[PDB]
Amino acid sequence: ALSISQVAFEHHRTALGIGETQPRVSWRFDGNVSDWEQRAYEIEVKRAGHDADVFRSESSDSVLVPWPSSPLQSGEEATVRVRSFGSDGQHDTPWSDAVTVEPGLLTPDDWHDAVVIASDRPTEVDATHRPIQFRKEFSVDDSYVSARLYITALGLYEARINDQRVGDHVMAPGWQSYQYRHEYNTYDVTDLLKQGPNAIGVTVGEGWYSGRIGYDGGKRNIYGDTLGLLSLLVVTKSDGSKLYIPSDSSWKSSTGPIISSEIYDGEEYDSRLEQKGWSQVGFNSTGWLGTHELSFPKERLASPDGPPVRRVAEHKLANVFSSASGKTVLDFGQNLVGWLRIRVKGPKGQTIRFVHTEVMENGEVATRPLRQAKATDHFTLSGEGVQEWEPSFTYHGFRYVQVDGWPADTPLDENSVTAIVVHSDMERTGYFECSNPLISKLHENILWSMRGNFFSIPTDCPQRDERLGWTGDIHAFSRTANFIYDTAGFLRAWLKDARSEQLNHSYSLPYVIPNIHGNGETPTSIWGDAIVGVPWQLYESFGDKVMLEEQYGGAKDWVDKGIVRNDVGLWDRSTFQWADWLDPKAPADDPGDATTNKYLVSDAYLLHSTDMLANISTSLSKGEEASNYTEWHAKLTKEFQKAWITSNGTMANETQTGLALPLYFDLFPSAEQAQSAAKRLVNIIKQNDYKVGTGFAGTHLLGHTLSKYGESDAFYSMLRQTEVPSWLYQVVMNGTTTWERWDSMLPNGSINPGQMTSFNHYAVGSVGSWLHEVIGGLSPAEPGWRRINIEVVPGGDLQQASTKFLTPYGMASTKWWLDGGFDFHLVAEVPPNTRATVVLPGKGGEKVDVGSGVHEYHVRCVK
């Protein structure tokens, strides 16, 4: 009936090497108990050599409660259990399963004598960096009880101890704004050591730190021009004393089988150059070079806030086929993000080439829209039996692979090639399916676009010469994203970088974070507004007041000093603006040439940010600020009206976006003028045969706007359209991801002629929140989901839908179906320690307050 399913620290999935000495604690519940609320909890904290302490709190809080013990030291592990007591004095949990928590290296001094090292091999000039192998042998000549490896790279790393891979993180440490914040990783390497002689080997690649990043050719050596390694191995002996094995000038270095490995262009691997045993003792290191120190400020080093990038899944080969010209092509059945794993035998010195693409065009793999990203891997065989390979420091976005040079010796099939799905390994929380198979597939496609683009940072796309942390895209998508996966730690980290970048950009937000573009970009609405909107949404989703406070300064400085204003406080009308980017009527070559005025759009979003900032101020008990922004919002609402709304309530541009924004942002001077505008919006949509008419500014809000005004049936009609432009067009064209453009592929199969065309962008997938909140009915009634609204709006000829969301408290869900107006049936699951408001469908539909449990509703003759 009731248990604790998960005990977690901050927003970490697991807590090894964390940055917090007083980490907050949360527990999720499992069980079908009715109307249950917590009155108290106990946290057991065990430190080696000490009796456990038990700390009791009279509290209903089960999310982000205080660390109850003395602060943890660097490298100090505690073991924790929790139990929770019910308010009725009748249902209490057993003790949770035990979990551990341990801070990392919290100060520069905690790194002991570890320094960043580089090879004595000269770095390449005006060229990609060949990966460097670094190695060290050491002795553990005392009995030991535990060991840790603390490691990062100026680049990306893969570490081995005695030829065993250290951990399961890939593309490590990921992409931070490295000049401000540089993540390092912590691993428990106790079981990889042996008594006596040991070896550590680490391969370092260029990654984002020094690789070629950016479009229009990009730039390399952005953060530095030399591959570097920082490493500290700490072994705790039986007597509690420690051995320290630092990175320093005693290490040796060499090139190895990786010839090149680049984010965009791919990896060239020559297996003939493998040096077997290099990560083990007794190795012949003849010909290896020395190493030297690189100056580096350890003040930037940080623990991750969120989960690492991992090889999350395999995806099997679906088909092998011949192209129009007889080339061999793999089809994985899904446009995925990661790389291949091969198992193959063939002639020594024969090279296999793998060219990865999202789509086919004109009977061949389509590389054209990748621009200056080759997405091509080369593997040269050794003929020394069956070889297994995956690339190390690249990734690709693809469904198809053209394969040249595959050896006759090995059949090309599901036993010799598979796809590896790679992304930030967040906990899955949100699920949706319904009776309409196309809309169910749309949700799957949104899920896959999220997976492809939550890759250390929230990327615009994963395939071409871009993959940057575009601010506007995540602003539009995060309401959707934060339901599908637990994004809290991931976005916490990103938003720290956003703030650092902003503080060196005159309080404006760079277009992409991390910022590769310098200080020349002028402030923009929607994109710049991410520094308000993403925090606001994060708080709605996870309820973390500490994180809202850390994000406050970015939001406030943006409104106060970042936005460039005209004389009455609206946007300066000489500024560049993205605004309603990729309006389906914009020309393919000029995606910003929208049907809605860029300043009408911008000013709407200025009002929205001001409103969000007022509300955040109120949440944080900043009264002066809250009143100030409330005042500014009212004055600027008048200026918005003067600029963009005629006296009779007509918008300057009567377009889907031009109407949807002032409707959602409540910018009309009267409820009557707003209601009239809502009916005109529905009429414009109907006259457009229900085809979508919004770009990035309008799309994420369009369904919510229509539902806000009781026009869900109109949106259902849009959602069911299968002709371009629409969501399901992309589905019926065999899309398995959401596309950048409504028409990234044209109906005869040709790719959009625009130079900027991707088949894997989450922005259009912002419709997912409407599936979750309106078809599925689920939304937070209090930030963090301790109070839930359950307001299913059936329509669109759906017969049933099932939606699930793993709240911070436990599972919430709806399952509804129709039969027998109609008879409506709903099963609603409400987790322990929460309450919900169930709003049953139809005119005068009953509203019902409920507590935890499984609730069944049967509504006969719904009109």
Ligand X SMILES: *[C@@H]1O[C@H](CO)[C@@H](O[C@@H]2O[C@H](CO)[C@@H](O[C@@H]3O[C@H](CO[C@H]4O[C@H](CO[C@H]5O[C@H](CO)[C@@H](O)[C@H](O)[C@@H]5O)[C@@H](O)[C@H](O[C@H]5O[C@H](CO)[C@@H](O)[C@H](O)[C@@H]5O)[C@@H]4O)[C@@H](O)[C@H](O)[C@@H]3O)[C@H](O)[C@H]2NC(C)=O)[C@H](O)[C@H]1NC(C)=O
Ligand Y SMILES: *[C@@H]1O[C@H](CO)[C@@H](O[C@@H]2O[C@H](CO)[C@@H](O)[C@H](O)[C@H]2NC(C)=O)[C@H](O)[C@H]1NC(C)=O
Ligand Z SMILES: *[C@@H]1O[C@H](CO)[C@@H](O[C@@H]2O[C@H](CO)[C@@H](O[C@@H]3O[C@H](CO[C@H]4O[C@H](CO[C@H]5O[C@H](CO)[C@@H](O)[C@H](O)[C@@H]5O)[C@@H](O)[C@H](O[C@H]5O[C@H](CO)[C@@H](O)[C@H](O)[C@@H]5O)[C@@H]4O)[C@@H](O)[C@H](O[C@H]4O[C@H](CO)[C@@H](O)[C@H](O)[C@@H]4O)[C@@H]3O)[C@H](O)[C@H]2NC(C)=O)[C@H](O)[C@H]1NC(C)=O
Ligand U SMILES: *[C@@H]1O[C@H](CO)[C@@H](O[C@@H]2O[C@H](CO)[C@@H](O[C@@H]3O[C@H](CO)[C@@H](O)[C@H](O[C@H]4O[C@H](CO)[C@@H](O)[C@H](O)[C@@H]4O)[C@@H]3O)[C@H](O)[C@H]2NC(C)=O)[C@H](O)[C@H]1NC(C)=O
Ligand V SMILES: *[C@@H]1O[C@H](CO)[C@@H](O[C@@H]2O[C@H](CO)[C@@H](O[C@@H]3O[C@H](CO[C@H]4O[C@H](CO)[C@@H](O)[C@H](O)[C@@H]4O)[C@@H](O)[C@H](O[C@H]4O[C@H](CO)[C@@H](O)[C@H](O)[C@@H]4O)[C@@H]3O)[C@H](O)[C@H]2NC(C)=O)[C@H](O)[C@H]1NC(C)=O
- Binding residue (CB under 6 A) for ligand U from 122, 240, 282, 518: 518
Distance, in Å, from the CA atom of 733 to the CA atom of 359, rounded to the nearest integer, reads: 11
Cβ proximity of 775 and 408 under 8 Å: no
Distance, in Å, from the CA atom of 499 to the CA atom of 492, rounded to the nearest integer, reads: 11
Distance, in Å, from the CA atom of 50 to the CA atom of 149, rounded to the nearest integer, reads: 26
Phi-psi region of 136 (alpha: psi -120 to 50; beta: other; left: phi over 0): beta
Residue that is written with structure tokens 């930037």 in the block: 300
Binding site for ligand X (CB under 6 A): 585-589, 743, 746, 748, 750, 753
Residues 541-560 binding ligand V (CB under 6 A) are: 559-560
Residues 200-219 binding ligand U (CB under 6 A) are: 219
Looking at residue 325, what DSSP letter applies?
Answer: T
171: nearest Cα among 422, 396, 493, 397: 422
Q: In what order do the strands lie in the sheet with 822-830?
A: 430-434, 800-807, 810-819, 822-830, 853-862
Cβ proximity of 321 and 331 under 8 Å: yes
Instruction: Provide the 10 A C-beta neighbour count for residue 219.
Output: 12
Helices (H), 543-583: 545-557
- Does residue 222 interact with ligand U by CB under 6 A? yes
Cβ proximity of 772 and 430 under 8 Å: yes
Distance, in Å, from the CA atom of 813 to the CA atom of 802, rounded to the nearest integer, reads: 7
328: nearest Cα among 431, 406, 256: 406
Distance, in Å, from the CA atom of 19 to the CA atom of 723, rounded to the nearest integer, reads: 51
Distance, in Å, from the CA atom of 160 to the CA atom of 279, rounded to the nearest integer, reads: 6
* 646 contact choice in ligand X, ligand NAG, Ca ion, none (CB below 5 to 8 Å, kind-dependent): ligand NAG
Distance, in Å, from the CA atom of 178 to the CA atom of 433, rounded to the nearest integer, reads: 40
Closer CB to ligand Z, 675 or 800, in the complex: 675
Residue that is written with structure tokens 């989960």 in the block: 307
788: nearest Cα among 800, 767, 772, 801: 772
Residue that is written with structure tokens 């503080």 in the block: 503
Closer CB to ligand X, 145 or 746, in the complex: 746
The helices-and-strands tally (H runs, E runs) of the chain is 14, 43
With vertex at residue 246, the alpha carbon angle to CA 245 and CA 247, rounded to the nearest 5 degrees, is 135
- Binding residue (CB under 6 A) for ligand V from 418, 628, 653, 721: 628
* 586 contact choice in ligand V, ligand X, ligand U, none (CB below 5 to 8 Å, kind-dependent): ligand X
* 597 contact choice in ligand X, ligand NAG, ligand Y, none (CB below 5 to 8 Å, kind-dependent): ligand Y
Q: In angstroms, give the least distance from the CB of 565 to ligand Y.
A: 16
* 842 contact choice in ligand V, ligand Z, Ca ion, none (CB below 5 to 8 Å, kind-dependent): none
Instruction: Provide the 10 A C-beta neighbour count for residue 861.
Output: 10
- Does residue 123 interact with ligand U by CB under 6 A? no
Q: In angstroms, give the least distance from the CB of 92 to ligand NAG.
A: 55
- Does residue 597 interact with ligand Y by CB under 6 A? yes
Closer CB to ligand U, 212 or 479, in the complex: 212
Phi-psi region of 216 (alpha: psi -120 to 50; beta: other; left: phi over 0): left
Specify the 3-state DSSP secondary structure of 805: strand
Q: In angstroms, give the least distance from the CB of 518 to ligand BGC.
A: 16
Distance, in Å, from the CA atom of 97 to the CA atom of 640, rounded to the nearest integer, reads: 56
Specify the 3-state DSSP secondary structure of 847: strand
Can you say how many angstroms the Cα of residue 566 is from the centroid of all Cα atoms in its chain?
36
Distance, in Å, from the CA atom of 570 to the CA atom of 567, rounded to the nearest integer, reads: 8
Q: In angstroms, give the least distance from the CB of 740 to ligand BGC.
A: 6
Binding site for ligand BGC (CB under 6 A): 460-461, 466, 470, 472-473, 578, 581, 756, 761
Closer CB to ligand BGC, 380 or 515, in the complex: 515
* 461 contact choice in ligand Y, ligand U, ligand BGC, none (CB below 5 to 8 Å, kind-dependent): ligand BGC
* 648 contact choice in ligand Y, ligand NAG, ligand U, none (CB below 5 to 8 Å, kind-dependent): ligand NAG
Residues 627-686 binding ligand Z (CB under 6 A) are: 637, 666, 668-671, 674
Closer CB to ligand BGC, 58 or 216, in the complex: 216
Closer CB to ligand Z, 106 or 839, in the complex: 839
- Does residue 408 interact with ligand Z by CB under 6 A? no
* 473 contact choice in ligand Y, ligand X, ligand BGC, none (CB below 5 to 8 Å, kind-dependent): ligand BGC
- Does residue 64 interact with Ca ion by CB under 5 A? yes
Residues labelled as active-site residues: 466, 740
- Binding residue (CB under 6 A) for ligand Z from 44, 611, 740, 743: 611
To the nearest 5 percent, what fractions of the chain are helix, strand and coil? 25, 30, 45
53 is in an annotated binding site: yes
276 is in an annotated binding site: no
Q: In angstroms, give the least distance from the CB of 315 to ligand NAG.
A: 18
User: And the tokens for 10?
Assistant: 């901050």
Query: Who contacts 529 (Cβ-Cβ below 8 Å, separation ≥6)?
Result: 472, 475, 558, 605, 606, 608, 609
- Specify the DSSP element, H or E, that contains 814: strand 810-819
Specify the 3-state DSSP secondary structure of 799: coil
700: nearest Cα among 760, 761, 633, 782: 761
Applying CB under 6 A, the site for ligand NAG has a residue count of: 7
Closer CB to ligand X, 586 or 643, in the complex: 586
- Specify the DSSP element, H or E, that contains 614: helix 598-619
Closer CB to ligand Z, 140 or 674, in the complex: 674
- Binding residue (CB under 5 A) for Ca ion from 507, 558, 742, 785: 507
- Binding residue (CB under 6 A) for ligand V from 165, 219, 316, 561: 561
Distance, in Å, from the CA atom of 215 to the CA atom of 461, rounded to the nearest integer, reads: 12
561 is in an annotated binding site: yes
486 is in an annotated binding site: yes
Residues 625-684 binding ligand Y (CB under 6 A) are: 652-653
593 is in an annotated binding site: yes
713 is in an annotated binding site: no
- Binding residue (CB under 6 A) for ligand Y from 376, 449, 595, 726: 595
User: And the tokens for 745?
Assistant: 């592929």
Q: Letter for the amino acid at 391?
A: P
63 is in an annotated binding site: yes
**Where the chain is broken, by preceding residue (C–N > 2.5 Å)?**
820
* 734 contact choice in ligand U, ligand Y, ligand NAG, none (CB below 5 to 8 Å, kind-dependent): ligand NAG
506 is in an annotated binding site: yes
666 is in an annotated binding site: yes
- Which phi and psi (to 5°) does residue 802 adopt? -130, 125
188 is in an annotated binding site: yes
- Binding residue (CB under 6 A) for ligand V from 157, 632, 729, 824: 632
- Does residue 565 interact with ligand V by CB under 6 A? yes
- Does residue 93 interact with ligand Y by CB under 6 A? no
Q: In angstroms, give the least distance from the CB of 7 to ligand Z.
A: 32
* 348 contact choice in ligand NAG, ligand U, ligand V, none (CB below 5 to 8 Å, kind-dependent): none
Residue number of the CB atom closest to ligand BGC: 460
- Does residue 789 interact with ligand U by CB under 6 A? no
392 is in an annotated binding site: yes
- Does residue 647 interact with ligand NAG by CB under 6 A? yes
Residues 736-775 binding ligand NAG (CB under 6 A) are: 749
Point out which residues bind ligand NAG (CB under 6 A): 646-648, 650, 733-734, 749
Point out which residues bind ligand U (CB under 6 A): 179, 219-222, 504, 518-519
Point out which residues bind Ca ion (CB under 5 A): 30, 35, 53, 61, 63-64, 88, 141, 158, 188, 268, 382, 392, 413, 486, 506-507, 561, 593, 666
Point out which residues bind ligand Y (CB under 6 A): 595, 597, 652-653
Positions at the binding site for Ca(2+): 30, 35, 53, 61, 63, 141, 158, 188, 268, 384, 392, 414, 486, 506, 561, 593, 666, 791
Positions at the binding site: 30, 35, 53, 61, 63, 141, 158, 188, 268, 384, 392, 414, 486, 506, 561, 593, 666, 791
